[PDB]
Amino acid sequence: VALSFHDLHQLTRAAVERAQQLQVPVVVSIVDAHGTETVTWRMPDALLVSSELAPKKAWTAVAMKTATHELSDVVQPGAALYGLESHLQGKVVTFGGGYALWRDGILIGGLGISGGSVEQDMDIAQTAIAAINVGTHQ
Amino acid sequence: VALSFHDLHQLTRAAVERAQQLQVPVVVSIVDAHGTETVTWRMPDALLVSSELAPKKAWTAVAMKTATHELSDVVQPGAALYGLESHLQGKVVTFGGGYALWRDGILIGGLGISGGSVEQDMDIAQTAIAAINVGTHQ
Amino acid sequence: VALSFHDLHQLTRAAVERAQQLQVPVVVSIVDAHGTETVTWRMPDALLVSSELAPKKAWTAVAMKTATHELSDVVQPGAALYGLESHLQGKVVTFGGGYALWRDGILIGGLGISGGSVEQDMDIAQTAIAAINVGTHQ
Amino acid sequence: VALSFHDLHQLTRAAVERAQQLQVPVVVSIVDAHGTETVTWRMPDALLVSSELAPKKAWTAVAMKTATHELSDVVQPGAALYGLESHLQGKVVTFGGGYALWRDGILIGGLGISGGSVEQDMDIAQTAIAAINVGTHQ
Amino acid sequence: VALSFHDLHQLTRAAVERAQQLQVPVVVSIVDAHGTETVTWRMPDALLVSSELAPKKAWTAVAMKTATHELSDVVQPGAALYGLESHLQGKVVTFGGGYALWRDGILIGGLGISGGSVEQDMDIAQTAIAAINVGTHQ
Amino acid sequence: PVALSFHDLHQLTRAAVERAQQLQVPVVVSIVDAHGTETVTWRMPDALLVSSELAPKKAWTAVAMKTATHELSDVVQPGAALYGLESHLQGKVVTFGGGYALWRDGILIGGLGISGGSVEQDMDIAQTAIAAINVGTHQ
Amino acid sequence: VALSFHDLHQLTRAAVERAQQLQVPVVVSIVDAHGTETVTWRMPDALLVSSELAPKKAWTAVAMKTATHELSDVVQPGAALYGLESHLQGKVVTFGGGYALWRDGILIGGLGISGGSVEQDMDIAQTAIAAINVGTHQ
Amino acid sequence: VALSFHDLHQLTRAAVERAQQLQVPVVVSIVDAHGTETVTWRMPDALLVSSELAPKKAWTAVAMKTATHELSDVVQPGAALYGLESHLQGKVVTFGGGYALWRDGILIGGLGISGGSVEQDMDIAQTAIAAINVGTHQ
Ligand code: HEM
Ligand code: HEM
Ligand code: HEM
Ligand code: HEM
Ligand SMILES: [Cl-]
Ligand SMILES: [Cl-]
Ligand SMILES: [Mg+2]
Ligand code: NA
Ligand code: NA
Ligand code: NA
Ligand code: NA
Ligand code: NA
Ligand code: NA
Ligand code: NA
Ligand code: NA
Ligand code: NA
């Protein structure tokens, strides 16, 4: 059930291809179900911050079993998990671009994209994920 | 006056059993009156973030002599301790799930639960604390 | 011009005496004009967090040539230095209890109190400062 | 295209000269297109916090290809990159004083000023940048 | 194959019992096959350092697939992995008391003991491991 | 003209993984550019957890010191010129083998780092991968 | 059983007085039995490193229940706890100047001095300890 | 008694000029008597490590009141300050290239050079120091 070589290779290829179509250089990061960095690819000229944000988005997706855009409302002032980003010492990113990857009810990894607008990062991520046979929810 | 073996054992057992009833895997953490990690137990499949949040809640409860849900208002924009989570470099958690433990007016420890919704974490924590009948306020 | 032995000893004594009158245990911290820790004194049962907050308040006062309560408005959402506490990795504290210490137009140090309410910490600090011949503004 | 000795020297001198005119001591920092510290200069009595803020402003400008005052709106509560300063563990500063430096469509570095009001920092930075043959936008 | 509740409970009980027989208080730590803290138990008056060293020994065992005493020679001056403890920022401990736990050729976790002499820690760890049906090599 | 291309990165990464498969040792492969930025990472199943940190560090060291990492082993020993270096740089530099600096036409273009086997295996894997593309390991 | 006001005061005074006699400026640090910083005093012109070394020496004494000079042999290459200083991320200091304080078989705190030679730090620490009624071994 | 503008400028220029004569690109760093970074200059293509080592050598010179080559013997296995580089969490560098700057018996700052061989760094640093009216010992 885990991510196979083919899964990893296709996710990464499809993300890079979609980023090229959008004309935005990104960092692509994939983590396994335990949060271990498994693939990283940086396109030329990607924003330097993206080297830290993409793997953090992928990690966040696994570590909270969620897509990172789904955390945006819950960390606001007044919301249930206000302060989370400081409580976890910057390890969680709470804007879009990270998705949890599921197969047959089992969490198999996380994908993180950074380098565009949040909308671009999410488009790239969703396009990549559509290239392989996986879900973004259990 | 201090947490005995029986206190630590029953707090842990009761927390895990309540979490089983709720069908949510959590990390349980107990710290002593000086904030030293005394017991940690991770249920299978608990959110990875919970491994950091539960001990931090337990620590926060002792370090601020308060339940963590009682810090939620006082760290908001405009409130007296705005910014506290950054000032203490992520050591304090300001949402529910941590309680201070008191016996005969003496602070004896802190219990932290993380892995569910905030309300679940607080339910589990309160249940565990009710199993040994210590107080949560001086 | 600098804090003398007598300055340091009287500041510390007066802060502790005032805390005793208020019946709240605090940490007292004094830093020099360069931000080096010079005196620390912890009263029994002071909040654990105060061991970190009091020196940070003192340091903040010198590092920003201000009282720490004067930073509260400027770090709010919408205000000029929003985010400051993260930018400086938790070294600055932006609620009351730290004061800059000045003599003959020269910055000689900083005093930080933590362990009570913000208002108690500011009272203690102001009382201590009144015990020696120094100002809180240039 | 890169920053020459002359570019660095003129930037630094013009910044210091403008700060002297404003009668505010600042830290001046210049990073290259990869974010490596290239020049630092501290004026006597500059706020201690400026030693950390000015290089961070310069680094931010390259790392996000933006002037730092342009990030102020996008990190607010409710905005698209809320929490960014914690996600990047304090490496990015999101109030004014940092500018990205461009020549012939190529990013050649970043300039950061800290020590005055945000407006003084920006005036100093803009004055310095006007002393050499560069743009602040691609 | 993984560590069951019974495995974890017996390891912990047996380590504590052995420590009691030796009259030395220890910290017991167990990590899973991915290095995630699963159980921590601190006996009263265990050396404060043991709170950091026991989990690090358990983690090292899984992270290097080795008992920690088997790393002592290989990190010495002149040996193949000299400097390893600094390369990994203190995450690995290279003296005895940590053991990797294997069942049917599969790595299922790590156990770490700290609080005694290295020889006591190893005794305690070996005694605990003998209480369950597992090997210390693949 | 001489930077690492897509093809360079791809071939380095593939050849490293292929060689690690031949040796039957799972590794982490890391490539950094001439400025030390992480460019590629690839982790093989069951690689030592430590190798997730050690491989990118090796690659970064190679560029940050313009050297192969095995060439630092003597110089950081007790009594040698750069004793303590690993602590001075807060663990960012690794001083045993497996990292190589990558050069073309006298220009530094990147760094490759391998971790997960013995130090010898990591070097073998790195050298094999480097041979798949025609760059040099010295200026 | 604990360090009283009189104990803390006399330790600190006696350490400063001795350091004055020797004409070496030091930092004095005292921690309680849980390792919490209780007193710090810095003499003018004390080595900057001493602001970190002295509290660490005091902490190490309690955390390891030993004098710090007693750790020097055991951390050497080839000895049982080689690497310890990196394993504990610099929290332990292994050269002289820190002493564990005992009364009636109970560990009550730790004293740390830094700023002279190791031998001066030890002379100062020992002179200070001799000013109160305590032992340096259980 | 302090480093003037001219002192800072001349030190920096002379260091860069000597590095050019040796044909090695270095990072030059100057700190004041309190260890605050005052000047940094990076020559093109200086080793990336030098960006961290040169300011650390300058800081070390002031923080230990010594040239950094004078620390080499004292931090060896078997010597009085073995482990120091870890105790201070990498803030001190114990090989040559850093010098303390003294005028009329007063410590006024530190100069640090990194990028060459240790001998080249020391040559550069000594040459720069010779360009102004200061000593390297009290
Ligand atoms: C921060 C790093 C700096 C470095 C490395 C530096 C380096 C130098 C060097 C190498 C020269 C000689 C140029 C030549 O080769 O002929 C020079 C000249 C000079 N620098 Fe600087 N400088 C620095 C900053 C400044 C600053 C901040 C000022 C004034 C605010 C200043 C004022 C001058 C003056 C007046 C000259 C003489 C010629 C001229 O007016 O342009 N320099 N500097
Ligand atoms: C540290 C030393 C520990 C000791 C000495 C210990 C001892 C025991 C004993 C004597 C029992 C009674 C049942 C029997 O006859 O086997 C027991 C039950 C139990 N303990 Fe512990 N325990 C320890 C730690 C833990 C921890 C950390 C947990 C975490 C949840 C735990 C969970 C339980 C549970 C759930 C039971 C009752 C259910 C069952 O045994 O199947 N114990 N323990
Ligand atoms: C890590 C990031 C990787 C990316 C972005 C990536 C991307 C690609 C792309 C774009 C192609 C088609 C290129 C072409 O031939 O025209 C390709 C082909 C291929 N890749 Fe990868 N790849 C990666 C890693 C790997 C690894 C680690 C392996 C093997 C261990 C691998 C094996 C292959 C093979 C066997 C082919 C087809 C053979 C051929 O090109 O004729 N790739 N990859
Ligand atoms: C660091 C925290 C210190 C605190 C909180 C403190 C507090 C006090 C207090 C409350 C007294 C009155 C004692 C009594 O008679 O009951 C006192 C007296 C004294 N202290 Fe301290 N003290 C401190 C440090 C020092 C140091 C470092 C020295 C000398 C190096 C010192 C020298 C004295 C002397 C000589 C007296 C007797 C003269 C007088 O009453 O002013 N103290 N201190
Ligand atoms: Cl915030
Ligand atoms: Cl070492
Ligand atoms: Mg049950
Ligand atoms: Na926050
Ligand atoms: Na905050
Ligand atoms: Na009971
Ligand atoms: Na913030
Ligand atoms: Na934030
Ligand atoms: Na080391
Ligand atoms: Na070292
Ligand atoms: Na070490
Ligand atoms: Na060391």
Residue numbers in the entry:
A (entry chain F), B (entry chain H), C (entry chain B), D (entry chain D), E (entry chain G), G (entry chain A), ...: 10 to 147
F (entry chain E): 9 to 147
Can you provide the manuscript's text about this entry?
Amongst its set of proteins, the pdu operon encodes PduO. This is an ATP:Cob(I)alamin adenosyltransferase (ACA) catalyzing the synthesis of adenosylcobalamin (AdoCbl; coenzyme B12). The Salmonella PduO is a two-domain protein, but only the N-terminal domain is necessary for the transferase activity. At the same time, the deletion mutant showed that the C-terminal domain and its heme binding are necessary for effective in vivo catabolism of 1,2-propanediol.
The PduOC:heme complex crystallized in the P21 space group with 2 octamers in the asymmetric unit (PDB acquisition code 5CX71). Each monomer has a three-layer, α-β-α folding that resembles the profilin fold. The octamer structure buries a large fraction of the monomers, leaving the two antiparallel α-helices exposed (right), but hiding the other three helices from the solvent. Across one interface, the β-sheets from monomers are hydrogen bonded, so as to form a large, regular 8-stranded sheet spanning pairs of dimers. Each octamer binds four heme molecules with each heme sitting in a pocket formed by the extended β-strand and an α-helix from each of two dimers. The heme iron is hexa-coordinated with bis-histidyl (bis-His) ligation by two histidines (H18) from adjacent monomers. The symmetry is such that pairs of corresponding residues from adjacent chains form the pocket (Phe14, His18, Thr21, Arg22, Val25, Val48, and Trp50). The eight heme groups in the asymmetric unit are highly exposed, with solvent accessible areas from 251 to 302 Å2. The exchange of His18 by Ala abolishes heme binding and this shifts the equilibrium from octamers to dimers. The bis-His heme coordination in PduOC is consistent with a possible role in electron transfer.
